């Protein structure tokens, strides 16, 4: 994959909006993931009992984890594909400790796209959606290659 500089700019321009309310984006993303693909909730021992959207919005622990996820993702996107150093510790933990399959990274990618549409209509048009899709796909493909370098099938 090779994104155009334009595509990267579309990505980073919408990312600036995410940065204006990182915790709100993070909550909405994790909640949308858990709603759309409930099996994913089982991966979080401390959260896995939460039932309703309002319950999840009140979890300080879920909100903190959202920030943690989006901070790491932000640093990776800003590398414009030159993210081997940032991916390594993340592949390590997600392959070996959390045991997350690549398909669940696909599920969270869908949730990111939904939330960006939900919070930023007018500024998340087809072109920005396409560029964000491509950046997230690159991320997932590169993680999957890292898993295999560690000897794991993601
Ligand atoms: C954009 C995609 C993702 C990013 C950037 C991301 C990032 C992170 C970061 C930075 C951490 C803490 C440090 C670490 O353990 O490596 C973490 C922990 C974790 N991640 Fe992810 N992650 C993503 C997707 C997922 C998905 C889809 C799942 C499960 C469905 C998952 C499950 C977990 C779990 C279980 C932990 C440990 C949580 C805790 O006990 O506090 N991750 N992730």
CATH class: Mainly Alpha
Radius of gyration: 15 Å
| Count of individual domains | 1
Order of helices and strands: HHHHHHH
Which shape, going by the Cα principal axes?
Answer: globular
EC number: 1.7.-.-, 1.11.1.-
Enzyme class: oxidoreductase
Modified residues (Phosphoserine): 4
InterPro entries: Globin, Globin-like_sf, Myoglobin
Walkthrough of the structure:
It is found in: Cytoplasm, Sarcoplasm. Helix 1 (5-19) crosses helix 7 (126-149), helix 2 (22-36) packs across helix 4 (60-78) and helix 2 (22-36) crosses helix 6 (102-119). The longest helix is centred in the last third of the chain and has 24 residues, at 126-149. By secondary structure, the protein is an all-alpha fold. Helix content is 71%, strand content 0%. The chain has helices at residues 5-19, 22-36, 53-57, 60-78, 84-96, 102-119, 126-149. The chain has seven helices and no strands. It has one domain: Orthogonal Bundle (Globin-like), CATH 1.10.490. The chain binds protoporphyrin IX containing FE. Residues 40, 43-44, 65, 68-69, 72-73, 90, 93-94, 98, 100, 104-105, 108 line the site of protoporphyrin IX containing FE (HEM). Residues 40, 43-44, 65, 68-69, 72-73, 90, 93-94, 98, 100, 104-105, 108 line the site of protoporphyrin IX containing FE.
